[model samples]
Target: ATFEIVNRCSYTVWAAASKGDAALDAGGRQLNSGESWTINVEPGTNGGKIWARTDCYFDDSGSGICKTGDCGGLLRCKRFGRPPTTLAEFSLNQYGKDYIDISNIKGFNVPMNFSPTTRGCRGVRCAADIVGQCPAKLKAPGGGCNDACTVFQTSEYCCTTGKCGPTEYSRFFKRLCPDAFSYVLDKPTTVTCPGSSNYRVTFCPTA
Candidate 1:
């Protein structure tokens, strides 16, 4: 599947994709406003997540820590970095069924869109103004909102064990961004699309 990562935010966005093996796009690139970068996925590339890093200052070596989604403080990411990052988690071309969804597993930074460009499928969007509306308790140092787990890192938020459900903090995000899979608290998932279809993940998308 071919995927285009487009940045439409007012500011610059460094796009990162955490996938299995060899790293997609060599782990990422800097995308200015109105820029779009492309990558392809073979069948069954699991644990694939596409995200954005904001407020960065990288020199020629491509190494520096951005304000958000600071993965390894390097231009090329080896990890998905910290939360408060909106993401596109995808299990691409999986056994004749592909899956991609907007998630707040890391909380939210920039509004995002995960939509297929083919197969007449509906797309998922988490374009809510979550950062600005983030609760004071879960606010970032000076960036996006933070999930309960990201801030507290306890079982109540992380639900390391079973029998856990949505907390009020999770509800805060859910109320604002219903497109995420219950903020990954209540149960299991993202919006559905078809297999073998290409997609465009738009940042700060209007629609």
Candidate 2:
């Protein structure tokens, strides 16, 4: 299935993916307000995470730094982006369905929406005023709201065992985005859809 990545933020954002070693388009690129990028994922693609970086400055050579979600300073990411950013995770065309989720486990940057363009499938979003409401302890520069796990590193918050329940911090993220994965162990936050469905990921989504 294909995925459309759109930027609706008032400012520019640099897109990055966990695994896009092939094409530059799917690897990392820039997106200005209202602009969009479409990605056609190869069948059997799994564990892919897409997120955007903010406050970036890339030289003509494509190397730079970003305040949030920077991926080793490469315009085309060679690695996963840093934390304090929201993410859309996917394992497509797997076991008869495509699994997807909107996760704040890394934290949150821009508001986002992950929806099926073909309809009849569920979508998820995280558009809370997290940047503005971030608690001092869990706040990062560049207006990114941090997750407790990243800030504290305690097993309780980190869910190192891959088993844990929601905490006040997770609740903070969940209250605003009910359909999203607020923490590492958030139950069934990952939704499934027909493998043939296409999807869209929007930053600073309107509604």
Candidate 3:
């Protein structure tokens, strides 16, 4: 499978991606406005995620930080980006289908859209202006709204316990992006497209 990252925002965005037990890719490359990068994933790739970092500054040695979605201050992330980031999560060629979603379960920073490159696949997106109206309690330090699980870290919010469901906080995100995953147990968040499709992940997509 292939994943293409497209930047529609006016400013540069640092794109990042990671898969289990593998080093991250596109660590801190400056994806300028109106540019795109395509990455090929191995067949049967699973548990991978992609996100963009903003307001970043780096030295010649590729060392520095980002105001949002910093991955342990490393240019090549060895792990996932921090919370308050919009995530494009995927699992390909598993169980006879491809699974994908735009997830705000960790938080919301940028507006994103996920669509197949070809016909016959549904497109899912979350393009709301979440930062401007971020609730006071869930606001992150730099910007964006933090997920309820990240803010409260309780069974009720994280759904770590038995039979938990969405709370008022999850509803806040759901109200904005109903197609995206608002919480851990968010139903209908996963979209199954044909395994033969390549996907496009757009940042700051126009509504």
Candidate 4:
């Protein structure tokens, strides 16, 4: 699945942390509108968590170590975007039979038909099948099988204030059926995901 983050504060935001146990750096950088970062996180037999941050900070204010939700002096927050989140349980056969099920896996919003490769599934079904096939149940908006997990980024406040804009999102399928099924996260390239041979791939900020 995909995830999205908005610049909620008056200043810009940056992805300040990496997966696994590590501390975020100070003044990591900034992120402007219409800009986003994507990552591929596969949930093995047991699902995993995804981490993100905004890198907001300030002086000590004589309070020592600062923690989230605790505004010692100034309320600079950490991990502004989606925190370490859990994936949903989803499994389907090549024949389109429901093998597993989960609910409410979060997602983001992007303009429909944004690009051939990155359209942000807005309709009830994915434009194309997972493996490319015609299925009657999966077609058009509001169809019975709501296969596509797309979302809308621009909301009431976001559009009015321009604080948030269109963002694409999808959640990880809770379980990988057949034990080795690999679905496209961000397809057709940018960066190729590590194949089934090696599941260990580094997800971090270069700056």
Candidate 5:
């Protein structure tokens, strides 16, 4: 399976992907408006994640910072993106199917859509204008909305105890993006389809 990452926004986006310790597509590559990039996922690849970075300023050495979704200030992320960013999570070729979701549990930076390129499979998205309606307390400095966990850091928001559940903060995100994972306990966010199907992930899909 492969992921075709498309940038539909008016601004530049640094698309990133990671599977365990490995980075995909040279990691943190830039995609201008209307541009796209593809990353092939080998069979049996699992626990991978993809996201977009915005307002980035990098030098020739690929060292700098991104206003949103920065990964330890590195162009090629060796770790997961920071909070206040949307994510496309995947577990490919696992148990005969591929698991995928558009997650706002880490908060939402840009609108996103994830769909299979092949027919006979369903698509899921969270293309709402979340930043425009973001709560003041959960707003990021650069842009986008922050998850309850990122804003509050309480067990009720973080689910650190594994016994915590959703709250009004998480409900706010859920109401706007029902298909996304709004909180740690959001169970219906995941969707499964047969493996070997190519997928498309778009940033700022509505733009």
Candidate 6:
């Protein structure tokens, strides 16, 4: 038999598992939005346990709302102890980072990974969700993939406009590293990470 884990909420998740009855172990896998995980279990065997976690953060500054229409997507996390047969649902929210940890059914600790096409809880926004064109306006300085775009504002000038528009694509860079720089038009740029360089073509208008 097999078990289906369904995510009925709007958050990304991670999954882990263990084989022991006490003290569960980390399975080292994560799931993205609107994803279902399946695990096989034998009949009349020890039931497995699972855990789901979200990346939504809470703060005293009261800045955790879906402001700017860019609440980094969702991540659903889980760890298992045995494989399940029945179905279960888990939900997560912005302020409430909810999850589920269930144990003892059949199969446990089956590893899985779910990476969402649209991520919201990743701290920084993704450019794919924004509007405009390539070489987005108000781009982070240095011109790299990690250099996320901030929400366009009146103070930043018309050049600060974006390719994806005022959508969830508006977000800060994940890591403010040396490569962080403003995006330029029509100019080919190169960025290196670890040991690889990603070449991004800049689309600048001809005067």
Which candidate has the top score in lDDT?
A: 5
| Candidate 2 C-alpha lDDT tens digits along 95-127 | 888888988889998889988898667888888
Q: Candidate 6, residues 99-172: lDDT per residue as tens digits?
A: 22211111111112122222222111121211123235433222122112222333222234433222222222
List runs of model 3 lying over 4 Å from the truth. 24-28
TM-score of candidate 4 on Cα atoms, chains taken together? 0.22
How are the candidates ranked when ordered by lDDT, highest leading? 5, 2, 3, 1, 6, 4
What tens-digit string does per-residue lDDT give for candidate 1 at 106-156? 888889989888886788888888888888988898599888888988887
lDDT (Cα atoms) of all candidates against the true structure:
0.82, 0.84, 0.84, 0.24, 0.87, 0.25
> Which is the leading candidate under TM-score?
5
How many collisions between residues are there in candidate 5? Answer: 0
Clashes of each: 1, 0, 0, 7, 0, 63
Q: Candidate 2, overall lDDT?
A: 0.84
TM-score to true structure, per model: 0.93, 0.93, 0.94, 0.22, 0.96, 0.25
- Please give, for residues 1-207, the per-residue lDDT of candidate 5 as tens digits: 878999999999998888748776576688999999988877777778899999999899988999889988888876888888899988888878888888898999989999999866788999888999998899998888999898887888999888877788888999999999888878776888887778999988787
Query: What is the TM-score ranking, best to worst?
Result: 5, 3, 1, 2, 6, 4
RMSD in Å for all candidates: 1.7, 1.8, 1.6, 16.3, 1.1, 20.3
Q: Candidate 4 on 60-159: residue-level lDDT in tens? A: 5422222211122222223222311111222212232222211212321110111112332211111111212212332223211112322223342123
Question: Which structure is stronger by lDDT: 2 or 6?
Answer: 2
Error of 6 at 147 (Å): 41
TM-score-wise, the better of 3 and 5 is 5
lDDT of 3 by residue, 84-151 (tens): 89998888889778888889988988899999986667889999988887889999888788998888
Q: List where candidate 4 sits over 4 angstroms from the true fold.
A: 1-11, 15-30, 42-55, 58-207
Query: Where is model 1 more than 4 Å wrong at Cα?
Result: 20-22
